[PDB]
Every structure is written in structure tokens, then in C-alpha cells.
């Protein structure tokens, strides 16, 4: 619980000497604001896309505009947003913009450097990536969500903080301004938003559907939802925007593992697109509106799309994962 | 942590069969949305401003447009919001608007119907008040913030959900539409916003400053801040948007009770106005004297010319229980 002025930053964690002024910025403001020296990138466990994979200290980037992009490679929101950041990096890197993709993992499998690499590569990320496997940077920045952005001017001052997915032109407008502030008279190409479509969904999709025992919020099958292995069935009626389980499942704090050959997930969802975050090796059989699809699942746990709909609508879904597949979440678009 | 699309609802609690569709609305949309039958007002512990303080059942308000307004009387955001709500109610109660002020206490003292009644009166609230002392309605509605608003149409369907303070015209515009859908051709006065100013601060004030042990986030004093009594002193340097203690204090989950005669609080804030939420009887001295008595509530300790980074100190007499600093 809390109180809130609309458009206010709802900052995570606690204030320290480094990040005490962040709250002087509001959330995704259209004009530059001033909210303190950027906090250190603390406790980064590893770096990609830098020479020798050596760290970057923010102070080495004074004189440059710095964009801090919090992301996780299996987050569908981040996947939708990152082509914009890529866009910006490619348009402005030679004009004074530096970008650091702070990868703070949502799931334990996102801690694996190799998996982050493959993710960044799928997304065409060539800017420095800081692996924040211990949330040290996330905490120090008082972040609360994926995606999130902190825009730092040539002075090392945070001027713009944006939580959540969307409003790219607002941020890019400010990026262009700060690049001029750093180098007055700088000539910039047309905005990257010219050739990068905004594919942000209407913000009324089914909320992120966690299967983890400590994050689940829309398990609608009744009975307990505790960690360990048990047998489940679908309830007489499943609520909207909710899931139920059938067959035997092993639950834990990462997600729900298929522990039998009859295992199934029923999902009522409100979205255009639906993704499952699943790991392991095996087969996903998905049934929607009497139409079945079969997806081979293997390698790095990530998002696999299971519905490519025509519009935002309420629908029902069934997914049948072969034994040993581990389901982390449903996410939406 | 969690993932977010901008302007999505950040609903609290969990999904039950009564509120499952709430996430089908976004946060404060300018167009009418459709996100399910309004959930029951459940576990309401008492009622004010109804006949005989009897309960109101939402199903008996079908045919009317119904604004559910979550508030707490010591919440300064809510105090700024309520005159807009009061304004809507005065303007539209005879055109089909019902207004239910669900009072969910932010603190233990806000559980006292007396204290609530007193707060409502200072805010000129004449509409029904549902006392949500066990957070059952807050929960059933999956709310997360004071203030919050859920707008229900005459068929019982939530059509608008708005978290946080501001954008009054957006909501009122939808209220007017829903009144027309409930009673086509209905004639309405000019928007209440015409004569009720929007005094919403820039959304970059110092974050609400809790003193309760469980909710503190900006104690910049260093050292322990746990339950019990102890002696304190101002740290060598105080971080911005933070507070520091001095003298003796008893620290519970509700707040920081002033013990010794020499107790003081230093605060670096970023705001135009600063208010303290303090209980107990005695004297509050700010660096000016302000006598503190009766229902624990907000007291204004700073009324500034403009939004400023500044510092203040308050010296509360023994006994005074400080719950928070809030801002404007």
C-alpha cells in the first residue's frame, strides 16, 4: 500500500546517499528534470559488449549522454522496447549517446551469461550490457519494473526516468536535447521513431501470470498452491484472467514443472498475443479455439509464442507440456 | 519487482472470482472501459452518512452511476482529492450519481469511527462512508493506492479505474457520460471542475516519509532503526529527501514516539508544503509553536512560496507520536 500523485515515480527499495534525489524526477516526463548524480552501477557480476568484457564506470562517460536501460531477455515488454533503444544507439552513438543495457534477471536462468548473450543477439543489441545478477544496481537505482530507463546528461545528472513500456518519442525527444546540450550545434539524423514502429499494446492485458509459488497472483483452480509435487484438476469454472492446472505438477519458486504425461494448463486471458516462458526439453501442445499447435522446446529457457491473435479479446487457452518442462509464466501482447 | 506497460493498472492483492476482470481496465483511461461487475463491498466494519449508519449494498445502487472513492482522512493526497469528489457529489447526486467513500485506514488511529467522522466533517463529506478497517474491500477491489477511484455504471459494471491523485476532468467527463447512459437526455450543470481548482502538486515531491519501523524508507541517520527506545543524533551529513532523529525516541510500527525533552527530527525535503501526521497531546515546535491535541491528523508545518529543496526541524514534546511527513 501507499499514496501517490499520478505520474509519480514509485521507487523500489530505500534511499541512500547516491540515489536520494531520484524522487525529484517524475515518471517519464516530457521536459528535462534534475534528479541528482546517477548512482553507481553497483555489484555488476559481468559485462558484455565491452572490450575484454571489462566494466564501464559511469564517470568515464561524462561528456556523453548516458541511457540506462533495465531489461531482462525473456521479458516480452523489454523485447518490444529494446528495438527502440537499439534504434537510438544506432542513430546517436556517434553523436554522443552511450547506452548501457543493465540486465537484471527476472528468473534464475537469466543469470547465465551465455543465455543473456543469445538473447541480446536475437534482439540486435550491440551496446554494453551489465549483468546485474544480484540486483545491486537495480536496488541502487531504486528501480521497480522492467522495462525502466534513466537518462543521464553529459554532467552525469539524471534528467529523465521512465518506468514501464511505452512513450518512446518522449524519451527520444529528450535524448536529442541532451545530445545538443552536450555538443551544441550537433547534427542528428531524423528521429529513430521514424522507422521504428510503436508496438506497445493497450495497457489492459492479463497481468503477468507467474507460476512461481511466491509470485502467483491468478491461479484460479482453488485448493492450495504450495511448493512440492501434487495432482491438480480444473475447477468447475475458471475465473477470467486466470489459470488452472490439470495432471501432476511440481511447483517451486521459479515456476511450475510438468511432472506427468497428462499435465495441462488452462488459461483465461485478455490479450492479443500470448507467450509462455518455459525451459527444459520436450514438447508443448497448445489448443486454442479447437486449433492445436505443437512446439518443440529446448535450449535456453525463454519466451515461446503460443497465440498470435487478431485483436485484443478475452479467450481461453490450453497448454500441455511434456514431463520435465518448467513453466515460469504466461506473458502477453 | 514486476513488469509494466505504461498506464496499466498496478492492482494489489490477488485475483478472485469477483474481481478477475478489473485488469481489463487501464489506469485512468479517458475513454470508457469495460472491466466486469463491481466487486462486493465486503468486510465493511461500519458506515457513516447513511440512514442509521446502515450498510449500502452495491446491487441496490443499480440504476445509478456509482463512484467508489478510496481514502484515509489523514492522507494529504486524499484531502486534496476529496473536494473534487464532494463537488461531483453535490453536482450530480440528483442526476443519478451515488458516491461511496471507502475509508481504508492507513494507520491504526484511522480505525476509530469517531476520528473518521471528524475528518469527514472537516472535508465536507456528506456522502456514504464505508469503513474498511480490515482492508477487505481494498483487497476485493485489488486496490494499491490512496487515493483510488472505481467508476461503476448503472448496470453495475466498472468502466473506469483511477489510481493516484489527479486528472479530475478525465474522470468527471466519464461520470457525465455514464449519467447520460443511465438516463438519456439528462440535463447536467457545467463541470464541477469549473469552480473546483486542480491543486495537484508536481509528482516529484519527497516520497511519503514513514516513521513506523515496517514502512521506513528514507531514514538517513545510519545505525539501527528497529523497534524499541534508544538515543539518537543527527548523522554527520543528512541525505536529501531524508530525515534524522535526535534525543530519545520509542520506535514502533505505527511511528516514532517522542520521549525525552530534547527529541528532534531533521528533514531534508523537496516540496512546497510539508505536513506532519502526529498523535498524542502536547506541543510541537518547528524551526514557531503548534499545540497538538485530539484525533491524530495532519498538521501543516511548512507552507512554502514554491517547490523547494529545503530543511526543517521539529521538536515534539514528550508523548507525541509522529507517524509521517507528507508533502504538497
UniProtKB/Swiss-Prot annotation, chain A:
The chain holds residues 363 to 695 of 695 of the full protein. One of its GO terms (molecular function) is oxidoreductase activity. The gene is dipZ. It comes from the Bacteria. Residues 32-180 form the Thioredoxin domain. Keywords: Cell membrane, Membrane, Transmembrane, Transmembrane helix. One of its GO terms (biological process) is cytochrome complex assembly. The keyword ATP-binding does not apply. GO terms for cellular component: plasma membrane. It is found in: Cell membrane. The keyword Transmembrane applies. Its main location: membrane. This is Protein DipZ.
Swiss-Prot record, chain B:
It is found in: Cell membrane. It comes from the Bacteria. Residues 32-180 form the Thioredoxin domain. This is Protein DipZ. The chain holds residues 363 to 695 of 695 of the full protein.
Amino acid at each position: 500500500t501507499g499514496t501517490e500523485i499520478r505520474e509519480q515515480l514509485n521507487l523500489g527499495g530505500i534511499v541512500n546517499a547516491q540515489n536520494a534525489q531520484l524522487s525529484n524526477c517524475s515518471d517519464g516526463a516530457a521536459q528535462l528534470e534534475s534528479c541528482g548524480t546517477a548512482p553507481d552501477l553497483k555489484g555488476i557480476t559481468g559485462w558484455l559488449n565491452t572490450p575484454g568484457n571489462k566494466p564501464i564506470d559511469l564517470k568515464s562517460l561524462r561528456g556523453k549522454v548516458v541511457l540506462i536501460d533495465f531489461w531482462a531477455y525473456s521479458c516480452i515488454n523489454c523485447q518490444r522496447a529494446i528495438p527502440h533503444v537499439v534504434g537510438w544507439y544506432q542513430a546517436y552513438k556517434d553523436s554522443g549517446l552511450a547506452v548501457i543495457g543493465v540486465h537484471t534477471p527476472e528468473y534464475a536462468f537469466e543469470k547465465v551469461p551465455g543465455n543473456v548473450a543469445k538473447g541480446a543477439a536475437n534482439l540486435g543489441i550491440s551496446y554494453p550490457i551489465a549483468l546485474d545478477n544480484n540486483y545491486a544496481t537495480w536496488t541502487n537505482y531504486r528501480n521497480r519494473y522492467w522495462p525502466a530507463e534513466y537518462l543521464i546528461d553529459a554532467t552525469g545528472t539524471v534528467r529523465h526516468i521512465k518506468f514501464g513500456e511505452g512513450d518512446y518519442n518522449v524519451t527520444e525527444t529528450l535524448v536529442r536535447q541532451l545530445l545538443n546540450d552536450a555538443k551544441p550545434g550537433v547534427k542528428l539524423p531524423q528521429p529513430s521513431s521514424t522507422t521504428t514502429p510503436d508496438l506497445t499494446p493497450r495497457a489492459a492485458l492479463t497481468p503477468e501470470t507467474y507460476f512461481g509459488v511466491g509470485k502467483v497472483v491468478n491461479y484460479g483452480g482453488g485448493g492450495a498452491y504450495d511448493e512440492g509435487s501434487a495432482v491438480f484438476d480444473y475447477p468447475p469454472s475458471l475465473a477470467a484472467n486466470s489459470f488452472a492446472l490439470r495432471g501432476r505438477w511440481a511447483l517451486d519458486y521459479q515456476g511450475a514443472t510438468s511432472d506427468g504425461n497428462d499435465a495441462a494448463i488452462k488459461l483465461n486471458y485478455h490479450a492479443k498475443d500470448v507467450y509462455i516462458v518455459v525451459g527444459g526439453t520436450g514438447t508443448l501442445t497448445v489448443v486454442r479455439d479447437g486449433k492445436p499447435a505443437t512446439l518443440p522446446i529446448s535450449g535456453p529457457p525463454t519466451t515461446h509464442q503460443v497465440v498470435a491473435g487478431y485483436r485484443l479479446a478475452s479467450e481461453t487457452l490450453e497448454v500441455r507440456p511434456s514431463k520435465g518442462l518448467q513453466v515460469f509464466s504466461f506473458t502477453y501482447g
